[PDB]
Design an enzyme around this catalytic site. Structure first.
Site, PDB file in Angstrom:
ATOM      1  N   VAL A 255      -2.774  -7.215  -5.834  1.00  0.00           N
ATOM      2  CA  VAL A 255      -1.958  -8.419  -5.793  1.00  0.00           C
ATOM      3  C   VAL A 255      -1.172  -8.532  -4.477  1.00  0.00           C
ATOM      4  CG1 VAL A 255       0.035  -7.386  -6.995  1.00  0.00           C
ATOM      5  CG2 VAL A 255      -0.359  -9.861  -7.126  1.00  0.00           C
ATOM      6  N   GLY A 256      -1.159  -7.463  -3.691  1.00  0.00           N
ATOM      7  CA  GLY A 256      -0.477  -7.495  -2.402  1.00  0.00           C
ATOM      8  C   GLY A 256      -0.573  -6.195  -1.638  1.00  0.00           C
ATOM      9  N   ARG A 257      -0.068  -6.219  -0.408  1.00  0.00           N
ATOM     10  CA  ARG A 257      -0.063  -5.047   0.446  1.00  0.00           C
ATOM     11  C   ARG A 257       1.055  -5.118   1.481  1.00  0.00           C
ATOM     12  N   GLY A 258       1.322  -3.989   2.115  1.00  0.00           N
ATOM     13  CA  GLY A 258       2.323  -3.930   3.169  1.00  0.00           C
ATOM     14  C   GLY A 258       2.046  -2.738   4.051  1.00  0.00           C
TER      15      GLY A 258
ATOM     16  N   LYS B  97       2.712   0.349  -7.149  1.00  0.00           N
ATOM     17  CA  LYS B  97       2.776   0.435  -5.694  1.00  0.00           C
ATOM     18  C   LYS B  97       2.264   1.815  -5.276  1.00  0.00           C
ATOM     19  CE  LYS B  97       6.096   0.050  -1.838  1.00  0.00           C
ATOM     20  NZ  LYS B  97       7.498  -0.229  -1.421  1.00  0.00           N
TER      21      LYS B  97
ATOM     22  N   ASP C 190      15.256  -4.445   5.295  1.00  0.00           N
ATOM     23  CA  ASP C 190      13.937  -5.072   5.475  1.00  0.00           C
ATOM     24  C   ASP C 190      13.878  -6.416   4.770  1.00  0.00           C
ATOM     25  OD1 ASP C 190      11.389  -5.211   6.671  1.00  0.00           O
ATOM     26  OD2 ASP C 190      10.412  -3.963   5.152  1.00  0.00           O
TER      27      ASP C 190
HETATM   28  N1  LIG Z   1       7.009  -6.500  -8.382  1.00  0.00           N
HETATM   29  C1  LIG Z   1       6.053  -7.203  -7.724  1.00  0.00           C
HETATM   30  N2  LIG Z   1       5.446  -8.303  -8.251  1.00  0.00           N
HETATM   31  C2  LIG Z   1       4.500  -8.988  -7.558  1.00  0.00           C
HETATM   32  N3  LIG Z   1       4.069  -8.632  -6.324  1.00  0.00           N
HETATM   33  C3  LIG Z   1       4.596  -7.544  -5.694  1.00  0.00           C
HETATM   34  C4  LIG Z   1       5.637  -6.761  -6.373  1.00  0.00           C
HETATM   35  N4  LIG Z   1       5.983  -5.745  -5.549  1.00  0.00           N
HETATM   36  C5  LIG Z   1       5.230  -5.867  -4.436  1.00  0.00           C
HETATM   37  N5  LIG Z   1       4.409  -6.936  -4.518  1.00  0.00           N
HETATM   38  C6  LIG Z   1       3.457  -7.365  -3.466  1.00  0.00           C
HETATM   39  O1  LIG Z   1       3.041  -6.237  -2.684  1.00  0.00           O
HETATM   40  C7  LIG Z   1       3.514  -6.364  -1.336  1.00  0.00           C
HETATM   41  C8  LIG Z   1       3.900  -4.999  -0.791  1.00  0.00           C
HETATM   42  O2  LIG Z   1       4.932  -4.435  -1.602  1.00  0.00           O
HETATM   43  P1  LIG Z   1       6.220  -3.819  -0.860  1.00  0.00           P
HETATM   44  O3  LIG Z   1       6.821  -4.884   0.021  1.00  0.00           O
HETATM   45  O4  LIG Z   1       7.067  -3.148  -1.913  1.00  0.00           O
HETATM   46  O5  LIG Z   1       5.488  -2.663   0.011  1.00  0.00           O
HETATM   47  P2  LIG Z   1       5.649  -2.267   1.582  1.00  0.00           P
HETATM   48  O6  LIG Z   1       4.292  -1.698   1.922  1.00  0.00           O
HETATM   49  O7  LIG Z   1       6.799  -1.265   1.644  1.00  0.00           O
HETATM   50  O8  LIG Z   1       6.002  -3.624   2.409  1.00  0.00           O
HETATM   51  P3  LIG Z   1       6.653  -3.766   3.906  1.00  0.00           P
HETATM   52  O9  LIG Z   1       5.448  -3.831   4.813  1.00  0.00           O
HETATM   53  O10 LIG Z   1       7.501  -5.050   3.944  1.00  0.00           O
HETATM   54  O11 LIG Z   1       7.462  -2.508   4.118  1.00  0.00           O
HETATM   55  C9  LIG Z   1       4.678  -7.327  -1.421  1.00  0.00           C
HETATM   56  O12 LIG Z   1       4.932  -8.025  -0.205  1.00  0.00           O
HETATM   57  C10 LIG Z   1       4.248  -8.263  -2.537  1.00  0.00           C
HETATM   58  O13 LIG Z   1       3.389  -9.310  -2.072  1.00  0.00           O
HETATM   59 MG   LIG Z   2       7.239  -5.007   1.923  1.00  0.00          MG
END
Ligand SMILES: Nc1ncnc2c1ncn2[C@@H]1O[C@H](COP(=O)(O)OP(=O)(O)OP(=O)(O)O)[C@@H](O)[C@H]1O
Ligand SMILES: [Mg+2]
Ligand SMILES: [Mg+2]
Length: 371
Positions: free
Chosen positions: A46-49, A69, A195
């Site tokens: 559903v997403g990534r970062g 996550k 962030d």
């Molecule tokens: N509780 C949630 N419900 C729906 N989507 C989510 C949720 N948590 C995270 N996501 C999706 O996953 C993506 C990455 O999660 P998150 O921002 O926690 O990880 P990150 O890798 O630390 O991101 P960043 O690159 O900003 O540090 C988010 O931008 C979001 O699109």
């Molecule tokens: Mg993030």
């Protein structure tokens, strides 16, 4: 040991003097991993970062829809830190932001030059900002893949580049007020998010529901601590991070909030669009001007990093110049311009606090509807 002039948070200065080691000392925790992902059915991504891949799923005992996550390799203390911050925020029995306001316990930095930044307006009511923090449900590590993983509350979110252009003036005011409540709460808990940006703000528009997520870069505020400046993302980095002023505080989140807000209001995304670390500062100074930039460097006696010596002289761009017929329905009033102006300041001490921002005239139509 970089800083010449020392700085302290204007508000909530001494939270982590009040609270002790068992609250803020994340390095000396041991993570109680669940041996199995057997309680969960993991579905699609559903997403990534930068630090994770995030998958939709279901908690099988209750049938509650969740996200998982999956953490990419990082220093293990960063994982302990994210977990500790998330549990501190969710486990607080009586969130400080739900209690009656106490001005003397709020404006804790008593330096005469810092007290002049107290605004004539402030939101001084109890609020539910704690309910805008994402909830951590579990910590799991697969025995075979060894991947650390965090189980969260699911939010039905659409990418901001799709959603934000659809939002009305009043809807932006609503959501940004929700974000400020979340920030006021985590700040009251002695925590900087570091962030703040659209990808880290989950919004379920049909339920008018906002959650602040991604606590992986968050840190506990300790008075006169010098922090790493290589945090957040380029476009949202406050001037303190770029000039390497390490003794920063909660106000960093308000620069980020302001840059996010400026993008939404003026429809220029991202608002400060640097092509490199160096050029990021150039993009900021191009807007706020060289004059105030130098006054800021003088105030804190900052020695500018080497890379910024090829910077030209810039006259301040009035905010009015960002108004056009495409955005005037969001930008065409004095209130929003004044709000943005009071958030996006070089000097971190000058910036509105979350509570001050919440009491700004721009949020009157939102405050009106609370009672
Ligand atoms: N509780 C949630 N419900 C729906 N989507 C989510 C949720 N948590 C995270 N996501 C999706 O996953 C993506 C990455 O999660 P998150 O921002 O926690 O990880 P990150 O890798 O630390 O991101 P960043 O690159 O900003 O540090 C988010 O931008 C979001 O699109
Ligand atoms: Mg993030
Ligand atoms: Mg604050």
């Amino acid at each position: 040991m970089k800083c010449r002039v020392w700085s302290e948070a204007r508000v909530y200065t001494n939270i982590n003097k009040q609270r002790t080691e068992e609250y803020w000392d994340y390095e000396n925790t041991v993570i109680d991993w669940s041996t199995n992902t057997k309680d969960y059915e993991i579905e699609n991504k559903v997403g990534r970062g930068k630090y994770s891949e995030v998958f939709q799923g279901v908690k099988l005992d209750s049938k509650v829809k969740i996200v998982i996550k999956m953490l990419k390799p990082v220093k293990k203390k960063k994982i302990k830190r994210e977990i500790k911050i998330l549990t501190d925020l969710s486990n607080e029995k009586v969130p400080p932001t739900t209690l009656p306001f106490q001005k003397d316990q709020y404006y804790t930095n008593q330096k005469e030059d810092v007290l002049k930044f107290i605004r004539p307006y402030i939101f001084d009511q109890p609020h539910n900002g704690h309910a805008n923090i994402i909830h951590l449900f579990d910590i799991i590590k697969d025995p075979i893949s060894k991947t650390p993983a965090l189980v969260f509350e699911y939010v039905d979110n659409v990418d901001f580049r799709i959603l934000y252009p659809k939002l009305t003036d009043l809807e932006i005011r609503f959501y940004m007020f929700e974000l400020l409540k979340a920030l006021d709460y985590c700040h009251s808990m002695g925590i900087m998010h570091r962030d703040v940006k659209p990808h880290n703000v989950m919004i379920d528009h049909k339920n008018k529901k906002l959650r602040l997520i991604d606590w992986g870069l968050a840190e506990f505020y300790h008075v006169n601590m010098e922090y790493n400046v290589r945090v957040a993302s380029r476009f949202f980095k406050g001037p303190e991070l770029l000039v390497d002023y390490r003794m920063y505080d909660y106000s960093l989140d308000l620069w980020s909030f302001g840059t996010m807000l400026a993008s939404m209001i003026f429809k220029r995304e991202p608002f400060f669009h640097g092509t490199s670390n160096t050029d990021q500062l150039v993009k900021i100074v191009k807007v706020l001007g060289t004059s105030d930039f130098e006054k800021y460097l003088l105030k804190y006696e900052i020695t500018l990093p080497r890379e910024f010596y090829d910077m030209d002289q810039y006259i301040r761009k009035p905010w009015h110049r960002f108004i056009n017929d495409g955005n005037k329905h969001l930008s065409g009033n004095d209130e929003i311009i004044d709000l943005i102006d009071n958030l996006l300041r070089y000097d971190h001490q000058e910036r509105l606090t979350a509570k001050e921002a919440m009491g700004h005239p721009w949020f009157a139509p939102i405050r009106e509807q609370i009672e």
